[PDB]
Structures are given as C-alpha cells and as structure tokens.
Subunit: 106 residues, 4 copies
Amino acid sequence: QPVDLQIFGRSLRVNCPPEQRDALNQAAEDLNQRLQDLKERTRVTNTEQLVFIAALNISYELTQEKAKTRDYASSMEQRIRMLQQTIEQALLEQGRISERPGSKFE
Amino acid sequence: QPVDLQIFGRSLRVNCPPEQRDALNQAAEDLNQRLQDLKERTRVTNTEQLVFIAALNISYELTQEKAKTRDYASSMEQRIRMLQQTIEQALLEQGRISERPGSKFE
Amino acid sequence: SAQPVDLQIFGRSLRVNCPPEQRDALNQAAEDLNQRLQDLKERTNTEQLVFIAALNISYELTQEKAKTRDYASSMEQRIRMLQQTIEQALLEQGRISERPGSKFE
Amino acid sequence: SAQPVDLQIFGRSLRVNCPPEQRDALNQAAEDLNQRLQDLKERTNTEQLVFIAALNISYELTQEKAKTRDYASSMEQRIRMLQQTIEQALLEQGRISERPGSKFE
Ligand SMILES: [Cl-]
Ligand SMILES: [Cl-]
C-alpha cells in the first residue's frame, strides 16, 4: 500500500496500511520539525548528515522513554507492596488488640 | 416507669422506659450469670459481698473495654496516616520520574 | 499472688483478694463505684443500690463492646475497599505493560 | 564539553559532537540504528533508508509516550480510589467515636 511522503525536501515512499496512515502523517510531521530544529541549532545544511544525527537523537530518546516506563513500573510495584503492607499491619493490629485477654480481681 | 426484676434471689425495682427494656432484661441476665459464676469460683455465699465484688469486677472490665476502644482508635489514626503517606509518595514519585529532562547528542 | 485488700465502698468495709499488679486498678474501680453509688443515691438500701449500679455498668459495657464491634465491621469494609484498589492496580499494570507495539514497515 | 566522535553507521562515516558522559549512550544508539538499518534493508539508497528508520522510531517513541500517559491516567484513578477510602475511614471514626452512651436511671 505505497504512500508517498515529503520530508525536509525529500520524497519518500513507505508501505503503510490506512489504519496507520494518521500515525505515518504524524511521524512525517515530527521528523520534519526535528530536522528543521536540528538544522537551526547546529547550522549544518547537509541533509544526509542531518537525518543521521536526527535518527541517532531519536533512538536515544526512545531508549530514554523506555527507561521512564521501566522506572514508573518499578516504582508502582513498590507502592503496591507498601499498600499491601499497610493492609497486613491493619489486620495484625486488629488481632493484637481484639485478642487482648480480660482481667478480673476475683 | 417502674420495672420489677429478679436477680440472684433479690427483688429489684428500676425506672426504665420501654425502649430500654430489652437492654434491662439483658443486663439482669448478665448480672445473674456473673454472680452465679463468682459464687462458684470463690465459694462465697453472702449475697451482698458477691454483688460488691461483681460490681468492682465489672467496673474494671468497663475501664478495660474503654482502653481497647482508645487503643483501636489510636492504631487506626496511624494506619490512616500511613495510607496518606503512601499517596503522597505516589505523587512525589510520579513527579520525580515525569519531570525527568530528556537528553540529546546535538 | 493474690492478697486480701480492705476497701471502703459507700460506708461498707469490703475485703477483696487482689494481686499487687492490679492494686492500682482496684483503687480505680473502688473510686468509680463509690462515685456511681453516690450519684445514684442522689438520683434515687446499700445492697440494692449496688445491684442497680452493677446493672448500669453492665449496660455501659455492652454499649462499649458494640463500639468495638462497629469499628471492626467498618474496617472490614475499608480493607475490602483497599484490597480492591490493589487488585485493580495490578491488573492495570499488566494491561498496559503488555500491549504489543506497531511499526509501519 | 562536547567533542567530535567518529561513528560508522551502515557503511557511512559520521561525525557527531558528544560529551563523554553520553559516549556509551551514543555507542548504544549507533548499535540500535545499525541493526534497524540492516533489518530494514532486508525487509525492503542509504539516506532514504535512514529517513524510513527515523519514521519508525518516531512512531515507536509516540507509542512509548502513550504508555507513560496511560499509566499516569490509570494511577490518577487509583489515587482517587485510595483518597475516597481515607475520607470514609475518617468519617466512620467520627461517627462511631461520637455516639452518646445511655443509662437506665
Ligand atoms: Cl450508675
Ligand atoms: Cl525500523
């Protein structure tokens, strides 16, 4: 299903089903913007060099996002365990107090 | 509203509205049983002495129950604070991870 | 080891066997019963007065026990509510963590 | 302080300015991009191949961000659920702790 795209003055063709077309348009728009911003802050105007550097940057950004995902998950596991421990403490306390043996004088 | 009761061979009269009558019957039954059990384990058969000792025992039992109530409450306040602290930690963590600044090469 | 303790309760000398570890509690019970008997006499035979005071304390103790029961029942619900939150968090983690990625080509 | 680093990416020598604290990340990015470009060439001009690889990574990064968002949304609900449990516990404590006692007489 060949889709023709224009990114940073370059003609690309990519096979893409219609269900992914909006995502493809968004990615084309993202990569266009990335290359424009990279060109601005580095003054490089060679396109092939720009796209290599952009691809390395975005690769690193994906690794960084996956770490954020992993870190959020690791933190949530701990929070859940902490919650479960407060339930266990609630039951232990309830037991400790409720089983208190009564006293009498005689 | 005079109610005539029989407890441990003694005739009592107590003013008691109808809305409290079941509670009065239950209390009469409780004090009857208490005096019978006290007589069994102490061998005392003087009624006035038994009822004095029973009243002291039950006074102490009420103080003991009120302590249980106070203790349960003190424990629950702590458990609630512990729960609230896990919520606060959840928000702090979320913030810590989510505000992580991204890196790029160039 | 229980030793006899002489108490004064509402005009009446009373001997009670009590271990020293409970002596303070005994004094406190004697003080509580003395105050109850005095108040009762004003509101209303010593022996009959003590039966009536013991009935009142019985009812108060029943009421205090109902408070214990009602705290416990209430907390059973709270724990069920927290456990449901934990079970959902775990489920959501699995649902999100397991989604397959897509690519174009 | 960024220094130029010579890399080899899919047959192409490339100079990238990178601070030493990010050198390992750069090597890892180069390895990831090299593997992507190879796989892509098998599935499917170097420059065009790199545009396509960058499109794929863009989409994957968008998808990874949606996971972050979806975890956050899910947790907002979980926190609301816990806060509701806390508010109820406090309310119940007050309700029970404040009940007036009764007596007979
Ligand atoms: Cl009373
Ligand atoms: Cl790819």
